[PDB]
């Protein structure tokens, strides 16, 4: 493979680890989700352009649309959490246990 493929894959891995490891702010994790989506977009676009598969040139656009849907969902949930607690910290979300 090209080394750019490894760079994009490691970008995805770093963003996934950033999401999986949580600091105080909820907003930081949403940004990590958006970063994973961006890396997926870049990787899929590179794969589609390299192989000249004409019909999937539209697939990353659909990816972006559902990324926007995910981001809107996350922001709405953050609005409700911050309205409840006055802060978007994840440690406030501990009313429910296992």
């Amino acid at each position: 493979m090209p080394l750019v493929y490894m760079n994009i894959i490691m970008a995805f891995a770093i963003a996934l680890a950033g999401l999986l490891m949580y600091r105080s702010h909820l907003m930081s994790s949403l940004l990590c989700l958006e970063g994973m989506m961006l890396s997926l977009f870049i990787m899929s676009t590179l794969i589609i352009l390299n192989t000249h598969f004409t019909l999937a040139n539209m697939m990353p656009i659909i990816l972006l649309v559902f990324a926007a849907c995910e981001a809107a969902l996350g922001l709405s949930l953050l609005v409700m959490v911050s309205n409840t607690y006055g802060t978007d910290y994840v440690q406030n979300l501990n009313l429910l246990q296992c």
């Binding site: 493929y5 995805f12 996934l16 999401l19 999986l20 909820l26 994790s29 989700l33 994973m36 989506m37 997926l40 990787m43 899929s44 794969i47 192989t51 598969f53 999937a56 697939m59 659909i62 990816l63 559902f66 849907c69 995910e70 969902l73 996350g74 949930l77 409700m80 959490v81 409840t84 979300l93 009313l95 429910l96 246990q97 296992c98």
Partner: protein, 347 residues
């Protein structure tokens, strides 16, 4: 919520699940999952409270992570083969990502932590939907790619799911958490047989869905979410408690009840493949689920707990809303063992 809006959201959830069901293209399956999650998030929050908000947030985070892993696996599979069809993945790493993603979507161990909390934080109707309808799509995807799964990882996750479901259910007094741990154990049982026979997985899915629907409807009818609240139902609706006790015995897998048939068929199918140790451990561990079912039956129907004075006023009122399918679900959850050979129609 406007009833029209609620109907539209439920139809959107169902249509996303059906899109996952009928698609031949990986992108369309991903789209179905995305639409299902998007329409599912408001349903968890229909009755607004901080607990519902927290449950919805945890659910969204878990499912979004699973969706990201799903898409990454699809992209790897495309990279190593210019294929979009869901037939059999061509890369072991992509397949491992796919398995981890689908297990996180299903709530299999060790990705089980979200299920009890989300189930506890929502209403009983949302819990019913989450524990019945939300399992169809990832299970269908796993059924389509069954020949590609690594048996070691899948069976490890299934055994962990059964063990953790039993142990977690041992410690619960809230009914929703009990049902969530029961769901985790049943998912483990279902995914244990998937690498060998998808028909067994489908049969286990159908029986588990029937029993879970009957149990959740019985819990809605007697509007209780804790053990002590359900302990009062004998003094107002003894028939409901008796049906609950019989359904609980069925869920424990005791013959000649219906819940025994999926475990029996899974064990015999696994023995056909020279797998003896793991089904033995699986049954010996489902003994724990039977134990906490029996504890609930002791507290609910077989003995009579003390009641309160205000129950006399409740004695004078009937149920305004009646559930149409509750009688059928109870009968199918209990008395369908003699109809076992009908499973051939599932393949």
């Amino acid at each position: 919520m406007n009833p029209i809006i609620y109907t539209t959201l439920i139809m959107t959830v169902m249509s996303g699940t059906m899109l996952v069901m009928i698609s031949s293209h990986w992108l369309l399956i991903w789209i179905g999952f995305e639409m299902n999650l998007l329409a599912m998030i408001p349903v968890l929050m229909k009755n607004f409270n901080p607990r519902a908000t927290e449950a919805a947030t945890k659910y969204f985070l878990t499912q979004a992570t699973a969706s990201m892993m799903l898409m990454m696996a699809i992209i790897i599979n495309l990279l190593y083969s210019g294929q979009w069809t869901i037939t059999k993945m061509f890369n072991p790493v992509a397949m491992t990502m796919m398995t981890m993603a689908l297990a996180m979507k299903l709530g299999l161990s060790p990705f089980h932590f979200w299920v009890p909390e989300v189930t506890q934080g929502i209403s009983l109707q949302a819990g019913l939907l989450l524990l019945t309808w939300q399992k169809l799509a990832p299970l269908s995807v796993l059924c389509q790619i069954s020949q590609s799964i690594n048996p070691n990882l899948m069976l490890t996750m299934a055994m962990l799911s059964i063990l953790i479901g039993g142990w977690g259910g041992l410690n619960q007094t809230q009914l929703r958490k009990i049902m969530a741990y029961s769901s985790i154990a049943h998912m483990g049982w279902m995914t244990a047989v998937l690498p060998y026979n998808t028909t067994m997985t489908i049969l286990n899915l159908l029986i588990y869905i029937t029993m879970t629907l009957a149990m959740f409807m019985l819990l809605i009818h007697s509007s209780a979410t804790t053990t002590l609240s359900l302990s009062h139902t004998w003094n107002k609706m003894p028939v409901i408690t008796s049906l609950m006790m019989v359904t609980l015995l069925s869920m424990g897998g005791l013959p000649p009840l219906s819940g025994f048939m999926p475990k029996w068929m899974i064990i015999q199918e696994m023995t056909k493949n020279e797998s003896i140790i793991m089904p033995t451990l699986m049954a010996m561990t489902a003994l724990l689920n039977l134990y906490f079912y029996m504890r609930l039956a002791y507290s609910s129907s077989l003995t009579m707990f003390p009641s309160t004075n205000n129950m006399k006023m409740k004695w004078q009122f009937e149920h305004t809303k009646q559930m149409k399918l509750l009688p059928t679900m109870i009968v199918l959850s209990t008395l369908v063992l003699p109809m076992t050979p009908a499973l051939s129609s599932l393949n």
